Nucleic acid binder design. Structure first.
Ligand SMILES: [K+]
Ligand SMILES: [K+]
Ligand SMILES: [K+]
Ligand SMILES: [K+]
Ligand SMILES: [K+]
Ligand SMILES: [K+]
Ligand SMILES: [K+]
Ligand SMILES: [K+]
Ligand SMILES: [K+]
Ligand SMILES: [Mg+2]
Ligand SMILES: [Mg+2]
Ligand SMILES: [Mg+2]
Ligand SMILES: [Mg+2]
Ligand SMILES: [Mg+2]
Ligand SMILES: [Mg+2]
Ligand SMILES: [Mg+2]
Ligand SMILES: [Mg+2]
Ligand SMILES: [Mg+2]
Ligand SMILES: [Mg+2]
Ligand SMILES: [Mg+2]
Ligand SMILES: [Mg+2]
Ligand SMILES: [Mg+2]
Ligand SMILES: [Mg+2]
Ligand SMILES: [Mg+2]
Ligand SMILES: [Mg+2]
Ligand SMILES: [Mg+2]
Ligand SMILES: [Mg+2]
Ligand SMILES: [Mg+2]
Ligand SMILES: [Mg+2]
Ligand SMILES: [Mg+2]
Ligand SMILES: [Mg+2]
Ligand SMILES: [Mg+2]
Ligand SMILES: [Mg+2]
Ligand SMILES: [Mg+2]
Ligand SMILES: [Mg+2]
Lengths: 386, 110
RNA sequence: GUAGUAGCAAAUAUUCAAAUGAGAACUUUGAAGGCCGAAGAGGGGAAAGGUUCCAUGUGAACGGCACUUGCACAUGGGUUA
RNA sequence: GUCUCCAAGGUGAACAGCCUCUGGUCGAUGGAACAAUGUAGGCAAGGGAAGUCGGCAAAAUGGAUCCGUAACUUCGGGAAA
RNA sequence: CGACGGAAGCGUCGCGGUGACCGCCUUGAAGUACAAUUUCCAUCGAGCGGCGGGUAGAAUCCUUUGCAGACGACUUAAACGCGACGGGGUAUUGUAAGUGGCAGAGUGGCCGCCACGAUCCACUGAGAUUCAGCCCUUUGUCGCUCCGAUUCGU
């Protein structure tokens, strides 16, 4: 018979299975649609989640209660040091989808990227790309490399660059094995894309060349892991009465008599967290460029001389010294987790998307407690230099 | 370098015993000290002096000292067909007047 | 077959050194840290049991892990009105 | 499950509970991890029985000193109202 | 060798080299006695003995990490960095012990002195704790830098 009362089902069937992701680095499932009329430009970037803080800004939203008022909103700091282009790959459009045609690598590869090709770098002989790097040293070999590039210009329909992070520059991560990913190149003709990619071989691409301030981006990564978990926490089913024999953190009925099988739509206990997620429409509030005032936490209203990093350092992460992005809201994953930034696939036209951000205050008090000092000097002056 | 060597260490038991069950805290301190000697000397055979055991249990089974200053002396075992050639002896060490402040690892002379 | 699976989880708790031994988380000594807390986990007796008492020794079995151990096994001793 | 004798110090009304001395004892197979579910013990913003057959469970009250104590009543009580 | 072919191109075409067929010539077929699979192809795969050329690694266990975790698995680390102390940063509590006081309700002796006194004040936002899953790090101290094991081939 019909259920006595109606409520929506617990959880979403669009995120199944709730298994551990088969990857640690966020995979870009779809790149932005390519517009040939625009200049060649990268579409994605890698970063590392440093921590969270809150900012205060004066809202400019005509017709809103907050118009010309101040609002406090949380933000996430993503440290985004420049990436290094080390190769190019071309794909051909076939009736069976895109097929990888060829992969051309740069002559010189850093030790950090070479570590990505080994499970035990120190114990190995470190032979990776040694024979490949030699054909850059001969005229006949150079001709072959150029011939491969011309082959991509003729047949390739999609061009992606091989780029890796400079993970050594963030000592807090305690990792020397860099992260490598394919970043699609949009804009221009195929020949321009290949020339654009080959020109960056062994060069650095700053985050500013991909993203900018006040634009909406998508963040891709793996959520925080939580291990084996019961239905109440995993799926949000309500608890059973106190007097339930054999426990109350369960689903009471897991199925009718017929079909004589448990269905895949019933909540079950299992892995929770460490799932791949793609979150949309994250506005960029600030882009910090090293060596510029934008890298500091100064604002047009607050002239206190201080850095982005809170006193005592970002908990579990360290001190941010490279380029970084200040992103509204929260980011997937734990501290130190590598996150993938992608350009929006939609046309951003809403007022919120076009709103011009103007920060008034950036909090830099300690996040390891009830921090009340924005700078170490302020704390020292408070206690008479302590 | 030299098989027979003695040094004085400051072991931070507080962080090693963090979140430990009360009824196993002091017993776990003995295991942690035994593990500490093995890494610092590379000798599986570690012997704990009764005086050091007394200090570990001085405040009962729960409240183990946060930091303990000990002397670890690696020496040769001279018994017929010993399972190992060397062994470490962990004993109590004197604390200076200033306490454990600015006190690193020190090598004891002959 | 089930299956080396269910299961060993009440009565707060053990640790260090040395001795003995083929073999020691489990025997013994010493030191420490705890418990019973006198309506006791202390010291006796009535029923009931019947040698379980004591010493020495011990291949196996048994003491639902283990034992060098013993209320087990072997030999001997022990209850005086 | 099974009759009975002896019974220290402190706190306190108290062979209550809690801690200690004499005496006894650490005998309950151990080791490593700290997922779900469970068993046992807890806590919780704002609301306060809306939960549920039903306040089930839990919480709240609790000792002592002084003040004060209604209906009703078989005049004794009710009353620690 | 050269050009072309990318939808799975693994093929096509051109030039040169070379064999066969064909052309001409020569010679043979039987008694294999009336049929008995007309064994002989390319598709890789090879397994071996030789003759040349080419190449001179990884994975896993043990250890480590906690961005992971029931166990597996997963993310890190393994001659320079790592590890153990210590220091600084940060944070929690709320001002340590000792010394001194012409602070302290008072009280007991002596002839102001002495004794008792919870508490109070100064040194003292002091002392204690702070990664165990916090941040930086030799001013400074110390150690270790790898004995091994299991496999894997077109
Ligand atoms: K129904
Ligand atoms: K939630
Ligand atoms: K419920
Ligand atoms: K009897
Ligand atoms: K008689
Ligand atoms: K549990
Ligand atoms: K009710
Ligand atoms: K003081
Ligand atoms: K003070
Ligand atoms: Mg898709
Ligand atoms: Mg976890
Ligand atoms: Mg029931
Ligand atoms: Mg915090
Ligand atoms: Mg079992
Ligand atoms: Mg049981
Ligand atoms: Mg157990
Ligand atoms: Mg027990
Ligand atoms: Mg025992
Ligand atoms: Mg008790
Ligand atoms: Mg007691
Ligand atoms: Mg009595
Ligand atoms: Mg047995
Ligand atoms: Mg006996
Ligand atoms: Mg017998
Ligand atoms: Mg009394
Ligand atoms: Mg009593
Ligand atoms: Mg509440
Ligand atoms: Mg409340
Ligand atoms: Mg109320
Ligand atoms: Mg109701
Ligand atoms: Mg109802
Ligand atoms: Mg009740
Ligand atoms: Mg009444
Ligand atoms: Mg420190
Ligand atoms: Mg760590």
């Amino acid at each position: 018979s019909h259920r006595k009362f109606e409520h929506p089902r617990h959880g979403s069937l669009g995120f199944l299975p709730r298994k551990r992701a088969a990857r640690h680095r966020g995979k870009v499932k779809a790149f932005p649609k390519d517009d040939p009329s625009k200049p060649c430009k990268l579409t994605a970037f890698l970063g590392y989640k440093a921590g969270m803080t809150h900012i205060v800004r004066e809202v400019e939203k005509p017709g809103s209660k907050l118009h010309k008022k101040e609002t406090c909103e949380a933000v996430t700091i993503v440290e985004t040091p420049p990436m290094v282009i080390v190769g190019v790959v071309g794909y051909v459009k076939t009736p069976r989808g895109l097929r990888c045609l060829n992969t051309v690598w740069a002559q010189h590869l850093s030790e950090d990227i070479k570590r990505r090709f080994y499970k035990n770098w120190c114990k190995s002989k470190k032979k990776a790309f040694l024979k490949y790097s030699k054909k850059y040293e001969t005229d006949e070999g150079k001709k072959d490399i150029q011939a491969q590039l011309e082959k991509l210009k003729k047949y390739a329909c999609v061009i992606r660059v091989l780029a890796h992070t400079q993970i050594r520059k963030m000592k807090g991560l305690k990792q020397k094995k860099a992260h490598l990913m394919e970043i699609q190149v949009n804009g221009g003709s195929i020949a321009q894309k290949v020339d654009f990619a080959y020109g960056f071989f062994e060069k650095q691409v700053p985050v500013d060349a991909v993203f900018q301030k006040d634009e909406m981006i998508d963040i891709i990564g793996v959520t925080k892991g939580k291990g084996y978990e019961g239905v109440v926490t995993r799926w949000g089913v309500t608890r059973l009465p106190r007097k339930t024999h054999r426990g109350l953190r369960k689903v009471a009925c897991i199925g009718a008599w017929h079909p004589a099988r448990v269905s895949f739509t019933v909540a079950r206990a299992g892995q929770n967290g460490y799932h791949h997620r793609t979150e949309m429409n994250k506005k960029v509030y600030k882009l910090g460029k090293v060596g510029q005032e934008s890298h500091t936490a100064l604002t047009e209203f607050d002239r206190t001389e201080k850095d982005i990093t809170p006193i005592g350092g970002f908990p579990h992460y360290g001190v941010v010294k490279e380029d970084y992005l200040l992103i509204k809201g929260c980011c997937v994953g734990t501290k130190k987790r590598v996150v993938t930034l992608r350009q929006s696939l939609l046309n951003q036209t809403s007022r919120v998307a076009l709103e011009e951000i103007k920060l008034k205050f950036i909090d830099t008090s300690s996040k390891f407690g009830h921090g009340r000092f924005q700078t170490t000097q302020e704390k020292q002056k408070f206690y008479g230099r302590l | 370098k030299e098989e027979v060597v003695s040094r004085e260490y400051t072991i931070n038991l507080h962080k090693r015993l963090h979140g430990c069950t009360f009824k196993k805290k002091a017993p776990t301190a003995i295991k942690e000290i035994r593990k500490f000697a093995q890494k610092a000397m590379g000798t599986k055979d570690v012997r704990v002096d009764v005086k050091l055991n007394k200090q570990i249990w001085s405040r009962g089974i729960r409240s183990v000292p946060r930091r303990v200053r000990v002397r670890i002396a690696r020496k040769r075992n001279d018994d017929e067909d010993a399972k190992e050639e060397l062994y470490s002896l962990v004993t109590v060490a004197e604390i200076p007047a200033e306490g454990l402040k600015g006190l690193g690892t020190k090598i004891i002379e002959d």
